[PDB]
Design an enzyme around this catalytic site. Structure first.
Site, PDB file in Angstrom:
ATOM      1  N   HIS C 201       0.659  -1.302   0.077  1.00 16.39           N
ATOM      2  CA  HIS C 201      -0.122  -0.046  -0.046  1.00 16.39           C
ATOM      3  C   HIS C 201       0.939   1.100  -0.011  1.00 16.39           C
ATOM      4  O   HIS C 201       0.477   2.340  -0.353  1.00 16.39           O
ATOM      5  CB  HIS C 201      -0.993   0.062   1.130  1.00 16.39           C
ATOM      6  CG  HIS C 201      -1.963  -1.021   1.096  1.00 16.39           C
ATOM      7  ND1 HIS C 201      -2.390  -1.758   0.044  1.00 16.39           N
ATOM      8  CD2 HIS C 201      -3.248  -1.096   1.762  1.00 16.39           C
ATOM      9  CE1 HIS C 201      -3.223  -2.463  -0.076  1.00 16.39           C
ATOM     10  NE2 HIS C 201      -4.181  -2.075   1.167  1.00 16.39           N
ATOM     11  N   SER C 205       0.381   0.495  -6.660  1.00 17.84           N
ATOM     12  CA  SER C 205       0.323  -0.577  -7.411  1.00 17.84           C
ATOM     13  C   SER C 205       0.878  -0.310  -8.720  1.00 17.84           C
ATOM     14  O   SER C 205       1.192   0.819  -9.275  1.00 17.84           O
ATOM     15  CB  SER C 205      -1.190  -1.284  -7.560  1.00 17.84           C
ATOM     16  OG  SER C 205      -1.650  -1.396  -6.305  1.00 17.84           O
ATOM     17  N   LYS C 227     -15.184  -5.900  -9.369  1.00 12.44           N
ATOM     18  CA  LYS C 227     -14.210  -6.703 -10.195  1.00 12.44           C
ATOM     19  C   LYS C 227     -13.756  -7.720  -9.621  1.00 12.44           C
ATOM     20  O   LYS C 227     -13.465  -9.174 -10.158  1.00 12.44           O
ATOM     21  CB  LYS C 227     -13.307  -5.862 -10.932  1.00 12.44           C
ATOM     22  CG  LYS C 227     -12.366  -6.373 -12.031  1.00 12.44           C
ATOM     23  CD  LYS C 227     -11.161  -5.871 -12.408  1.00 12.44           C
ATOM     24  CE  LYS C 227     -10.518  -6.161 -13.419  1.00 12.44           C
ATOM     25  NZ  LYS C 227      -9.107  -6.222 -13.557  1.00 12.44           N
ATOM     26  N   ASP C 228     -12.967  -7.566  -8.220  1.00 12.48           N
ATOM     27  CA  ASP C 228     -12.702  -8.677  -7.361  1.00 12.48           C
ATOM     28  C   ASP C 228     -13.581  -9.739  -7.089  1.00 12.48           C
ATOM     29  O   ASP C 228     -13.341 -11.063  -7.068  1.00 12.48           O
ATOM     30  CB  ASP C 228     -12.131  -8.132  -6.137  1.00 12.48           C
ATOM     31  CG  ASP C 228     -10.707  -7.373  -6.500  1.00 12.48           C
ATOM     32  OD1 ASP C 228      -9.816  -7.968  -6.876  1.00 12.48           O
ATOM     33  OD2 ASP C 228     -10.783  -5.970  -6.141  1.00 12.48           O
ATOM     34  N   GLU C 271       2.508 -34.169  -5.415  1.00 11.27           N
ATOM     35  CA  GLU C 271       1.271 -33.344  -5.995  1.00 11.27           C
ATOM     36  C   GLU C 271       1.713 -32.847  -7.476  1.00 11.27           C
ATOM     37  O   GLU C 271       2.959 -32.332  -7.760  1.00 11.27           O
ATOM     38  CB  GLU C 271       0.927 -32.604  -5.187  1.00 11.27           C
ATOM     39  CG  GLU C 271       1.198 -32.903  -3.734  1.00 11.27           C
ATOM     40  CD  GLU C 271       2.279 -32.434  -3.016  1.00 11.27           C
ATOM     41  OE1 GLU C 271       3.337 -32.485  -3.687  1.00 11.27           O
ATOM     42  OE2 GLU C 271       2.205 -31.557  -2.094  1.00 11.27           O
TER      43      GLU C 271
END
Ligand SMILES: CCCCCCCCCCCCCCCCCC(=O)OC[C@H](COP(=O)([O-])OCC(O)COP(=O)([O-])OC[C@@H](COC(=O)CCCCCCCCCCCCCCCCC)OC(=O)CCCCCCCCCCCCCCCCC)OC(=O)CCCCCCCCCCCCCCCCC
Ligand SMILES: CCCCCCCCCCCCCCCCCC(=O)OC[C@H](COP(=O)([O-])OCC(O)COP(=O)([O-])OC[C@@H](COC(=O)CCCCCCCCCCCCCCCCC)OC(=O)CCCCCCCCCCCCCCCCC)OC(=O)CCCCCCCCCCCCCCCCC
Ligand SMILES: CCCCCCCCCCCCCCCCCC(=O)OC[C@H](COP(=O)([O-])OCC(O)COP(=O)([O-])OC[C@@H](COC(=O)CCCCCCCCCCCCCCCCC)OC(=O)CCCCCCCCCCCCCCCCC)OC(=O)CCCCCCCCCCCCCCCCC
Ligand SMILES: COC1=C(OC)C(=O)C(C/C=C(\C)CC/C=C(\C)CC/C=C(\C)CC/C=C(\C)CC/C=C(\C)CC/C=C(\C)CC/C=C(\C)CC/C=C(\C)CC/C=C(\C)CCC=C(C)C)=C(C)C1=O
Ligand SMILES: CCCCCCCCCCCCCCCCCC(=O)OC[C@H](COP(=O)([O-])OCC[N+](C)(C)C)OC(=O)CCCCCCCCCCCCCCCCC
Ligand SMILES: CCCCCCCCCCCCCCCCCC(=O)OC[C@H](COP(=O)(O)OCCN)OC(=O)CCCCCCCCCCCCCCCCC
Ligand SMILES: CCCCCCCCCCCCCCCCCC(=O)OC[C@H](COP(=O)(O)OCCN)OC(=O)CCCCCCCCCCCCCCCCC
Ligand code: HEM
Ligand code: HEM
Lengths: 98, 56, 379, 440, 51, 47, 74
Positions: C201, C205, C227-228, C271
């Site tokens: 933060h 970004s 949107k998230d 895996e």
């Protein structure tokens, strides 16, 4: 000639599509952070609007019409002198530190 | 005074302080372990499995 | 007198982190995975708790407990397969997140990048212990192999391995400690993710273009939150398809045989999300060299901000470098497939070349290429 | 002219001694002007708590009048000849220098012989000067720098005569009586503790003859101070109305001779002085100055080396706003420990040049040269030539500074004096902890 | 980088080598003490009585 | 040079109290003002 | 970092329309399909080749392995 590959890479880079002239795509380090600051008012405002346009287009996932794609031969390097001066000052400062 | 020479030799620089802490811990572990083991051995003399193992 | 959103001390951080957080205007969908990780973690916390609701981490009853979950408990199968496929999907989003960070030049953010590397390490360790828990044939044998890999460490190898085992071999003690470690670690991941967000933060970004978006920031609430949510719905779509139409698609059936420490399974493949390192581990003939290569494969992400030399932050405007990055992704896929396959004539050499080229791209090819376009673009 | 030749080609400070013990000294070089002064060895250091401030009172009353020159006649002599009379009395020294023309050097000496020996001490004048002392002390209250320095001296040398201020307590100012002043002038103005120094165009033989013809009838041929103690403490005068907060931090320095003075003066020279009205700003080699100019957390700071006979105060005084005192203390202490642990050669060379320039540029004009002569004959016992100063600077190196700062700065209890909005100022524990470096 | 080396940094290193090296000595002593490295404590007079 | 002049000058600060006739002595300028700022030396005036 | 200490900008005019008068799907297909085709054209020649060579490597490995598992004249 070498200019052929230079122009080819310029066209393939894609920042000309968004209207950016090279210097608008610079990674902002400290030296750059000073370089923008030292810019005159007109150049700074033009750069900030140009970057605004690019951000808008990328958000919309669009590009300019073919006409307003900044030409390779018209890509003015408005930041190279200021950035080079900042780099030279930093080199002199480091040399004095030595 | 003894403490003044002690401080000048090995207490001024914190590196000396740390080294002294390390070596003092190394020796103090032996000292304390021996002392406490001797004390417990003495107070419970003839009861733990150390006074009697030789008897079997 | 003042908005409670920006007045309440607890509401301050939430408002400044998700409501009025200035975010870049041109953020692509590749950033939505940042939410997709965190949300996914909660499911792993939410489901993983309910698995812990009915689970006896004991050698003689762990598998019986898992079967009782998937067969007797009300909708226990839903929780179990949701949890497993959610872990697999979590690793999918983790890989996509690392790819996004590599592409759009987010590793310039340093502190967040290193914290993310630590997050990756912790998540892989957590997944390893989780796969150990069901106590199937593949569980036990893969755990034995992976912990035996630690014997390659000089001097302290055997004692460290016996320490991790909790005894002489993977047994009661190993499973019992692995369950508790698997319980604790995700909370460490949560705190470290909070630290990740705190560090991020402060630098805003990185938009896809790579140029600073400080002058085109937008409020977070009406935007990406929705949107998230859409991204989370797509993620739920993929996860629900996986759970409800083929629960064991990404999982070896051999795990359903109870762990018998007398029969080596025909294959000891871990895996799907670990083979990319496992293949590297197979490539190096030396055991210690193999372990060092395995750990360095993940550690190489830390060196990335140092190796970057192109004067452009992002990969949006570097075509040749983009070809190199997609070569890297293809190499990762090839390594996963090679790790899936046994150690035979056609696969050994392919694994060697895949490992060598995967390291070569990150260390040499990418920076050397980054020099090339800088020289090409008159700077 | 290779600099060293210039230092070698400096006229020597010729010094002689009369029978009474007067140390006469002169530095005749070229000028038609001169400064002639008598540097007493008195001051507030030699004063009991009842007598505190008597030196200031005597200094004030000295120029008013004498028996031979009643009152304004004395002034009439100084101004009519173009001379400028002045006096200054610190904690351990007191001097009355009369700048004048070299032609009228005789009269000035006679005039000086009047002021120091045959004073007036008129009672009515005593009251008139008592009131002036009171109002002038109220004036000095406004002087933040002086007040903070007196606070530093009080908190450092507590319980010792060094703590006593030059002016003395306001109560004493009213309680001093003519008997006390007469005793002080008859007990601390004795001939042995006198230095008659003259600069400018003053031939030494003429000066000696004048002293023997004017200063002869003085004291013939005990109060000699007590070695004071350093007490790490602090005085915090929290007063949130003053715009800026003056802070002074000091450690026990060297003695007056104490050759360690030469390295320390270099070390302090590395820190340097900064204020708001300087030039380069974020370019000075001083890290404190550069950081201060980069963040404007400093209004005005300097390094002081107040050095008494048996001890002294070595430290820094800074003036800043209310929200930058902690950052100050951090950077100041950090630079101190940086010099303490790793001093390196380059800044040592810079400090050497800085100290050379300080000593050279200070010694110009008859008044500073005469002050140097008078102070040197009292403190060092000799006039240290500039060539010797150059020699003592030359061999100072990085290791010498790193060791002297280690022996004076590292892990030493400091003395702090803050005044103004000094709430942000760290407590004594954090300041003391700053003087040791766990990274070392 | 080229910002390193040069005159000033080498005497900086010379100044800080004793401290850093003997901090490393501190670390070595602490490690052997905490881990009870039998190999090293074989060659110390008092602490042979442990084993 | 090494000397910070003498009067270290704080802006946003007050002067020194001058409530004495003697203190006043001399304040009255006789020669014109002359400003002198300098690198490494603080700015002062002279009247 | 909150709104206000972000940048300096001048002479930039931004218009907008409320979400309640502009269609949320304005000529969705008509302009989307050419847009997606252009985006695919821009990146296919730089994204696909590594994946297709991976495909070739993978298939080649599959047969080479199972041939190695086949018999041999003797
Ligand atoms: C016909 C074959 C498919 C289309 C052609 C794809 C191709 O060759 O190049 C992609 C081509 C060129 O890439 P681009 O448009 O420059 O990418 C812009 C963004 O970086 C990436 O796209 P974006 O972030 O601008 O928009 C989101 C986009 C892409 O979304 C994603 O890539 C993430 C979600 C999908 C799963 C992740 C793996 C893929 O979503 C879609 O295209 C379809 C929905 C996918 C699931 C929901 C999201 O783009 C598209 O076709 C659309 C986006 C990519 C779809 C895959
Ligand atoms: C190894 C021995 C420690 C050492 O060499 O520290 C050097 C160095 C501190 O630098 P320094 O020049 O010795 O001290 C003055 C500095 O300006 C750094 O301190 P400052 O001037 O910024 O603030 C003064 C004061 C302010 O207090 C602190 O910074 C931390 C005080 C923590 C007290 C305990 C309650 C909280 C837990 O610093 C300290 O008390 C020491 C800070 C370094 C240790 C912090 C971790 C202690 C864990 C126990 O330590 C670190 O940088 C931290 C990592 C190494 C120590 C912890 C492991
Ligand atoms: C695996 C893990 C999970 C991965 C998925 C979840 C994470 C990513 C979430 C991304 C997200 O929420 O939005 C991404 C992305 C953000 O851009 P957008 O909101 O589509 O706006 C169009 C773009 O500006 C780009 O506009 P354009 O230049 O392509 O033309 C306008 C428009 C029209 O183009 C199309 O609709 C493409 C033609 C076929 C339909 O483009 C699109 O709709 C592109 C998206 C594909 C449809 O949205 C989608 O991908 C939409 C969801 C997928 C389609 C609807 C499914 C029901
Ligand atoms: C454009 O940037 C951003 C986003 O989306 C692209 C985001 O969604 C978010 C918001 C993200 C989240 C709320 C989820 C991820 C966060 C965490 C895992 C940190 C821990 C906090 C939680 C509330 C989740 C865990 C809770 C419990 C165990 C952020 C911060 C962001 O920066
Ligand atoms: C469970 C929760 C509770 C746990 C116990 C809590 C109660 C005990 C806490 C510890 C005791 C108090 C602090 C003791 C340490 C100390 O003095 O710290 C301050 C001290 C400083 O105290 P100081 O400032 O008085 O002395 C140092 C300053 N000079 C050098 C000038 C003298 O810290 C240090 O000295 C740090 C360096 C040395 C110590 C660290 C390494 C030593 C070796 C360790 C083993 C080998 C590895
Ligand atoms: C299959 C994998 C790729 C799926 C998405 C399709 C794709 O890569 O489309 C191309 C897209 C272009 O991104 P863009 O930044 O617009 O490129 C500008 C070029 N001048 O490419 C990207 O957006 C790059 C995204 C990279 C990170 C996510 C994908 C890799 C994950 C690896 C794990
Ligand atoms: C747990 C460690 C001990 C904590 C309690 C003791 C303590 O805090 O001692 C003080 C020590 C050093 O900190 P301090 O005295 O402020 O000096 C810093 C440098 N000037 O504070 C420390 O944090 C040092 C701890 C050891 C390293
Ligand atoms: C970091 C997120 C997590 C990941 C990636 C993860 C991963 C896994 C995986 C892959 C398995 C194996 C499932 C199987 O083979 O069927 C597993 C099992 C398990 N996990 Fe988790 N897990 C996570 C969080 C948690 C948490 C927080 C808990 C406890 C609250 C938990 C409890 C369990 C339990 C009890 C099992 C054994 C039952 C089972 O096999 O599903 N998990 N985990
Ligand atoms: C525990 C898993 C993780 C969570 C929950 C997490 C969380 C987040 C979130 C929510 C964001 C903001 C959205 C975004 O930019 O994508 C973010 C950004 C970022 N994360 Fe992570 N992260 C995780 C793992 C990682 C990893 C493995 C790395 C790489 C080592 C990493 C490095 C970054 C970087 C560099 C950014 C900035 C991206 C940008 O804004 O351009 N994170 N993280």
């Amino acid at each position: 000639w070498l200019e052929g590959i230079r122009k080819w890479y310029y066209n393939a880079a894609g920042f000309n599509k968004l209207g950016l002239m090279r210097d608008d795509t610079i990674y902002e380090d400290d030296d750059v952070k000073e370089a923008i600051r030292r810019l005159p008012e007109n150049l700074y405002n033009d750069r900030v609007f140009r970057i605004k346009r690019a951000l808008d287009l990328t958000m919309r996932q669009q590009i300019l019409p073919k006409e307003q794609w900044t030409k390779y031969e018209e890509d003015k390097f408005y930041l190279e002198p200021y950035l080079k001066e900042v780099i030279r000052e930093r080199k002199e400062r480091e040399e004095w530190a030595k | 005074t003894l403490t003044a020479r002690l401080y000048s030799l090995l207490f001024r620089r914190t590196s000396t302080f740390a080294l002294t802490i390390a070596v003092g811990a190394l020796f103090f572990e032996r000292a304390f372990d021996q002392g406490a083991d001797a004390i417990y051995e003495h107070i419970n003399q003839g009861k733990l499995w150390k006074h009697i193992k030789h008897k079997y | 007198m003042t908005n409670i959103r920006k007045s309440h001390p607890l509401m301050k951080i939430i408002n400044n982190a998700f409501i009025d957080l200035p975010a870049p205007s041109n953020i692509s969908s590749w950033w939505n995975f940042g939410s997709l990780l965190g949300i996914c973690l909660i499911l792993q916390i939410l489901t993983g708790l309910f698995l812990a609701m009915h689970y006896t981490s004991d050698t003689t009853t762990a598998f019986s407990s898992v079967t009782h979950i998937c067969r007797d408990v009300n909708y226990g199968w839903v929780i179990r397969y949701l949890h497993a496929n959610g872990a697999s999907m979590f690793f999918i989003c983790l890989f996509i997140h690392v790819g996004r960070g590599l592409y759009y030049g987010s590793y310039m953010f340093l502190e967040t990048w290193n914290i993310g590397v630590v997050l990756l390490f912790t998540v892989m360790a957590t997944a390893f212990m989780g796969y150990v828990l069901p106590w199937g044939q593949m569980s036990f044998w893969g755990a034995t192999v992976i912990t035996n890999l630690l014997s390659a460490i000089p001097y302290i190898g055997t004692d460290l391995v016996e320490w991790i085992w909790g005894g002489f071999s993977v047994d009661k003690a190993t499973l019992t400690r692995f369950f508790a470690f698997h319980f604790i670690l995700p909370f460490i991941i949560t705190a470290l993710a909070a630290v990740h967000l705190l560090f991020l933060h402060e630098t805003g970004s990185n938009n896809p273009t790579g140029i600073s978006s400080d002058m085109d920031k937008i409020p977070f609430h009406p935007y990406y939150t929705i949107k998230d949510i859409l991204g989370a719905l797509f993620m739920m779509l993929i996860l629900l398809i996986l759970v409800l139409f083929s629960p064991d698609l990404l999982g070896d059936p051999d795990n359903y045989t109870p762990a018998n420490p007398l029969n080596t399974p025909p294959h000891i493949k871990p895996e799907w999300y670990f083979l990319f390192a496992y293949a590297i581990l197979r490539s190096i003939p030396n055991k210690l060299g193999g372990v060092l290569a395995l750990v360095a494969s993940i550690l190489i992400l830390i060196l990335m901000p140092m190796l970057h030399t192109s004067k452009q932050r992002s990969m949006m405007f570097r075509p040749l470098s983009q070809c190199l990055f997609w070569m890297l992704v293809a190499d990762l896929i090839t390594l996963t497939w090679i790790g899936g396959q046994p150690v035979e004539h056609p696969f050994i050499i392919i694994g060697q070349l895949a490992s060598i080229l995967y390291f070569l791209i990150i260390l040499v090819l990418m920076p050397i290429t980054s020099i090339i376009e800088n020289n090409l673009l008159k700077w | 002219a290779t600099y060293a030749q210039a230092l070698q080609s400096v006229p020597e400070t010729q010094v002689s001694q009369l029978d009474n013990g007067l140390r006469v000294a002169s530095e005749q070089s070229s000028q038609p002007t001169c400064t002639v002064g008598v540097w007493i060895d008195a001051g507030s250091r030699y004063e009991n708590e009842k007598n505190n401030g008597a030196g200031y009172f005597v200094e004030h009353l000295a120029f008013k009048g004498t028996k031979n020159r009643p009152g304004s006649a004395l002034e009439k002599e100084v101004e009519s000849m173009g001379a400028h009379l002045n006096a200054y009395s610190t904690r351990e020294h007191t001097a009355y220098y009369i700048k004048a023309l070299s032609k009228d050097l005789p009269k000035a000496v006679e005039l000086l012989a009047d002021i120091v020996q045959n004073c007036s001490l008129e009672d009515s004048q005593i009251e008139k000067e008592r009131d002036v002392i009171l109002q002038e002390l109220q004036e000095n209250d406004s002087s933040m720098r002086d007040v903070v320095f007196d606070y530093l001296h009080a908190t450092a040398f507590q319980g010792t005569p060094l703590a006593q201020s030059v002016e003395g307590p306001s109560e004493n100012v009213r309680k001093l009586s003519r008997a006390d002043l007469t005793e002080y002038v008859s007990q601390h103005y004795k001939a042995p503790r006198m230095v008659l120094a003259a600069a400018g165009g003053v031939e030494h033989r003429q000066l000696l003859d004048l002293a023997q013809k004017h200063f002869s009838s003085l004291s013939g041929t005990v109060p000699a101070f007590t070695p004071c103690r350093f007490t790490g403490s602090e005085i915090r005068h929290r007063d949130d109305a003053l715009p800026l907060a003056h802070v002074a931090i000091a450690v026990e320095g060297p003695g007056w001779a104490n050759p360690d003075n030469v390295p320390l003066q270099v070390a302090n020279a590395i820190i340097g002085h900064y204020d708001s009205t300087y030039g380069g700003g974020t370019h000075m080699s001083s890290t404190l100055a550069s950081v201060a100019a980069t963040r404007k957390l400093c209004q005005s700071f300097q390094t002081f080396n107040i050095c008494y006979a048996e001890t002294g105060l070595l430290g820094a005084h800074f003036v800043c706003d209310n929200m930058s005192i902690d950052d100050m203390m951090f950077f100041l202490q950090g630079q101190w420990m940086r010099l303490c642990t790793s001093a390196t050669e380059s800044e040592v060379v810079r400090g050497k040049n800085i100290l050379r320039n300080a000593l050279v540029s200070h010694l110009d004009g008859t008044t500073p040269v005469c002050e140097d002569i008078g102070r040197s004959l009292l403190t060092y016992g000799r006039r240290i030539p500039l060539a010797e100063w150059e020699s003592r600077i030359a061999e100072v190196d990085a290791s010498v500074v790193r060791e002297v700062c280690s022996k004076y700065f590292y892990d030493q209890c400091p003395a702090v004096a803050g005044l103004g909005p000094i709430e942000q100022l760290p407590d004594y524990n954090r300041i003391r902890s700053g003087m040791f470096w766990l990274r070392f | 980088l080229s910002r390193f080396l040069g005159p000033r940094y080498r005497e900086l290193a010379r100044n800080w080598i004793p401290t850093a090296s003997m901090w490393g000595a501190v670390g070595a002593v602490g490690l052997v003490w905490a881990t009870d490295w039998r190999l090293i404590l074989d060659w110390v007079p008092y602490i042979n009585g442990k084993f | 040079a090494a000397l910070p002049a003498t009067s270290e000058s704080p802006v946003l600060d007050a002067k020194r109290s001058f409530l004495c006739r003697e203190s006043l002595s001399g304040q009255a300028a006789g020669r014109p003002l002359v400003a002198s700022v300098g690198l490494n030396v603080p700015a002062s005036v002279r009247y | 970092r909150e709104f206000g200490h972000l940048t300096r900008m001048r002479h930039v005019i931004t218009y907008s329309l409320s979400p309640f008068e502009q269609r949320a799907f304005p000529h969705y297909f008509t302009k989307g399909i050419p847009n997606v085709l252009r985006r695919t054209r821009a990146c296919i020649l730089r994204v696909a080749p590594p994946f297709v060579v991976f495909y070739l490597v993978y298939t080649w490995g599959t047969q080479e392995f199972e041939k190695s598992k086949r018999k041999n004249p003797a």
